[PDB]
Amino acid sequence: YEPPVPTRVGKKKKKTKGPDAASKLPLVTPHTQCRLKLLKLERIKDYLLMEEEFIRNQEQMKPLEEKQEEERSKVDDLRGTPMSVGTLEEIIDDNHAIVSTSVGSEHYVSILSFVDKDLLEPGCSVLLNHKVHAVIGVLMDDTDPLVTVMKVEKAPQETYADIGGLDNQIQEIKESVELPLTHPEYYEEMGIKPPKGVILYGPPGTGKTLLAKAVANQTSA
Amino acid sequence: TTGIATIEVFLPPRLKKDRKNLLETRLHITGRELRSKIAETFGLQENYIKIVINKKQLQLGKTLEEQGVAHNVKAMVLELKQSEEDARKNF
Amino acid sequence: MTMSGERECLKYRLVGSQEELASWGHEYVRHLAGEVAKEWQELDDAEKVQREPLLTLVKEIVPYNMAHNAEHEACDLLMEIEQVDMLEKDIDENAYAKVCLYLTSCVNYVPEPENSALLRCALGVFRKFSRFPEALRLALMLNDMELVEDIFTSCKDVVVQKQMAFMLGRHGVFLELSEDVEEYEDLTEIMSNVQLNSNFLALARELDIMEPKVPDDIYKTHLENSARMNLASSFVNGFVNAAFGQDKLLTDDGNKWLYKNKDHGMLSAAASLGMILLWDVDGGLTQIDKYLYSSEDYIKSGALLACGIVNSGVRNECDPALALLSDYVLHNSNTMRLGSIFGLGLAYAGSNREDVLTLLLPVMGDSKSSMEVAGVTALACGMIAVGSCNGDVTSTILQTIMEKSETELKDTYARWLPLGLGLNHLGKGEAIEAILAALEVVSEPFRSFANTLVDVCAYAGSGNVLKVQQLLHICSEHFDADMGAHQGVAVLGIALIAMGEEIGAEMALRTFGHLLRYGEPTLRRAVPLALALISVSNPRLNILDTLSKFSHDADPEVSYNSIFAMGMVGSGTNNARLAAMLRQLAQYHAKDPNNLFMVRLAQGLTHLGKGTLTLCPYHSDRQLMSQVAVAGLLTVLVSFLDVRNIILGKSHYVLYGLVAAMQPRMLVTFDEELRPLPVSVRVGQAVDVVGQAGKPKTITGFQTHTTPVLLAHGERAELATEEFLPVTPILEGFVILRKNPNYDL
């Protein structure tokens, strides 16, 4: 016997998260409403017509078993119900992994084709079949209670206009947390990454937290 | 003119000479004499050179006119490693 | 202006006051200008007596638009009415760059005959404004040899002419100058790329990567937890050390290594020796001569093919390669020919030279010429006369095809005959119906294969959405192999046509996904090659992740083809991430000799030229297409439709067709005397700057380097300082820098 050799490089999930997926339409330039933008948009439209006609033809003569609604309906049959939530312990192979149920028992199961293999990392929550415990999905972890606490959901009502006398202090903080995001071109043309960190120090009540409240008010991050 | 042809030859970059160099010789001579004199005219060893004439390898036995040479023809010197008999005798 | 305004808004302005148009407002004329084009289409031939005031407005609308930087709107007015002829008279010094850049971006989406018309009109602006180097680029895109002559000789600045000769040499277009032209000698040397070897070696010494690399350093088996193996490492050794002249395995005493291979393994191994000596015609031929006298048949013809590699990409004033290969095209032994025609093709690919073709032509019709050499003959003569529509090569390719019997047309070496025909009409477009007429006589299913190959090659690099409409119609009907042989080229066709510009290209990836999903095995066996063609030497993550998923495919051919495409996509990019995948793929496919051979092949291509060589057919900011490169690209990829029998079989020498596409990713700044001149440059991802006025940055996420640097796919180059004025706006290949008089004022 020989150990199985994975074809995927590494054991971590793909770094990219929350992309446009199949809707990653190209950045047609320029945004101005002119002919070549119309010409560029037409080419995108044309290939879609080609794509639409081709896909329809294949599914038209595809077997009744092999249909978009049938295969998805089948997928539930392979998954079954209920879908046990486990924990990924190790990725032995491309289609094989060790998972542990909530009872602490580990099983060497097979990862089915329809599972998103790029979302699989050890410690992640996986969906397992109730009977055969095979990996049949990855549960998107809900926002942790610790995540909610740090995140400021609503921007504070304190703005820079509500800060008096800290003209230089306001200016310095903008170039490190506001200007790089609003106007990144200034830094790129200069060839310098923005100032990495910033610390606000002074006597109590001088406006250190207030400037951060102003920063949080006018930030897209 | 007068039985002498303008033969422009090419030299390899290892011998840092003027690559646009001119060799003048008769046409009644054969490739054996031609190969020897090119080595002398640009300071080369005759044993390790191949010559390209009229888009075809310089056959040593046959004389120049019956080879197919002409006026204002182009030539090249090909540096050789191991002699033609030595390479055959090598293995 | 407020309501629809059909034949009204223009009418009152036309009949009413005929004062200066801008006096009524910029928004009014913008509405007025649009309606000018609207009724122009409505107006018929009999309504020529209605356009008298119509021409007057455009003679004033255009100056108004360029006055307030609304220039892209102006070009739009003449485009719709098909009167872009009068734009050049009113072009000013402050806005010449914006109109040409806008119009040139439009030629990739407008169809014929407005392709050339917009190209010539953009060419006229450059010629009038004395911007010759960019005018030559437009002429090359038009493939107008007469214009290339006229553009070249019109310039009296020899410094510009010297830099111009580089672009012709980079494209592989040769120009026969007259001795009366000043500086005739250096001009022919520059375009012939005779100094390319020394210039390429100059960077290697500068970039301290001259040291040879053994395939073991690429395999890295010490980190891993046969005849085919030896043949694989022969390609890896050649690919990694390509065009370098030095190697620790063949430049040394290679007889032990050369004889380690067996059968046709020694054919490619001997030929791999010339790939280290690529572009080194003088010193490279000095090393092959030892193996030229070998008694074993494979070594000599393998060396005979190594002749064609050593002159590939270089034009010698008198050719050495023809001398070494003329007397072996009709040799009794088939192998000796096999190294002759294929070598002869690579040495003069993109030449259209009659002497070689006449010497190469009767080989195809030879009775003793097997189908293997007959297809090789088609590949070669197609490569010499690529994109030339030479009727002489065309006549025989048909003549050989229909003379052959129906049974031997089943052989996959007959697939190279339409490719030679297709290459001969590469990119011409509407010049194949007469040829397509002759192809109906040929029997099926080869006629289905033959017409698809030439039709695809006719529209290569055109982006014609109409042409790719029929190819998917071929892809729509799936056959329950023998009948669907032509299906593979149809998938490969989408890549060959959409490759012209970015927008058309990445639509193809979406379609390529469905073909890999809904397609039949033979249909999906060609999708990886289309990925390799669409993005050669451009290692994007979307394709590489796509190719990775089907690397371990159930269908063996898709498995081999995907692995080769992965290395082909990152050919010469030295991608650290991609090499890790191949190393992981080597472990997974270690027990599969067929799969592992592609894995080793991809590692060599990934480290082609030690990261200093590219196979991309597009240079000059990815706008100008090299006919030679696609010919080698098409030769390998079409041959990969039968990877089991051609690549994995006895004809793996066809991988040497990639030599015709091997060029350096170069940015070398030369002085006016052509000596190296290292200066600070900025290298970063290219940015589209159509539209937005003012001065937009053409590079993002850039870094500052000295000039002798390698530019992979998609990165532009701008001079960091203003001390030197480049001759060409395109900072690619060899560029001549002129000292700026304004600098140090």
Next chain:
Amino acid sequence: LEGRTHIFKIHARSMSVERDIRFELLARLCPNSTGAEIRSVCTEAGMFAIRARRKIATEKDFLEAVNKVIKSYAKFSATPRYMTYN
């Protein structure tokens, strides 16, 4: 001094600096300074120019950067205490 000059060139490689930036002088103005400070000096030097709406950083900006980083921020410097530990 040779090392600090080298670090200055590494971090000021992609800067749009003037022609005559005396990096040897800048290395001499920060005798005992870490490479991180030199990076901040380069970053702050471009910050004085970006503040002034200038696309090219002059030598004066680097001079002001050294004063702001090496001198003004010397109160928070970790070097004086950590050379005793090393």
Next chain:
Amino acid sequence: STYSRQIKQVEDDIQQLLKKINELTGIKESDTGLAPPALWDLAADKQTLQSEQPLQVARCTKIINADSEDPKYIINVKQFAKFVVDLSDQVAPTDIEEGMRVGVDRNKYQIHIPLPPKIDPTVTMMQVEEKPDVTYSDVGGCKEQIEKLREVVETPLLHPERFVNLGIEPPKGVLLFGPPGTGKTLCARAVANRTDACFIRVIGSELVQKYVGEGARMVREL
């Protein structure tokens, strides 16, 4: 602006097309971790769900009568139970050793496949999988330091042949020390970018753990 009306017509038709394309193509949703339908080999999955049976992870404890032809294996099935089982017919007797993890069935618990040793997922993530964007050319003033660092941690792996021939045992450890900002981690990041072997990054604060014996345990599994 004369094409503003025509832009939105083709933009809306395009947006309708992607929505239409996604209808037949599928790939809608992903919250249950579903791969795009182009990768669905449902024919193989149905066979996989039947032909390939699930295997419980167990640890071999003791081999009884290994010399004879009836070797009995005592296994520890995690939290389930302990069983005395025999090997399957498709696994060699020499491939299972005491103390190693094995895969056992749910019917007779016979060992079916040897398994990799259990490793903490936190320790697994401590290995570097994306190399940093720092090279040795980005470190200035550390010439002599860099050669000493490379010749211990980079050269022996790259060119091991020059050490075995002379009977050389290269040093297997380097300590980088200096004041903050001097380039200790920067040089280490350069090492990871250039190295081709496996690189594991450990932060000393990551080895501090709540329970007694964890930090030693994580070092052991590291």
